[PDB]
Amino acid sequence: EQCGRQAGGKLCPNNLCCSQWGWCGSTDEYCSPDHNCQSNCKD
């Protein structure tokens, strides 16, 4: 995993959103509070 709880709090590179799964990306499944985004979220 790249980020988030699964990776002991690592932030994503390039301002990317950390999904609930601990991976980095820029679309809704990564960024939405409705999908429990962990960091750099779209709110």
Swiss-Prot record:
Disulfide bonds join 3-18, 12-24, 17-31, 37-41. It comes from Hevea brasiliensis. Residues 1-43 form the Chitin-binding type-1 domain. This is Hevein.
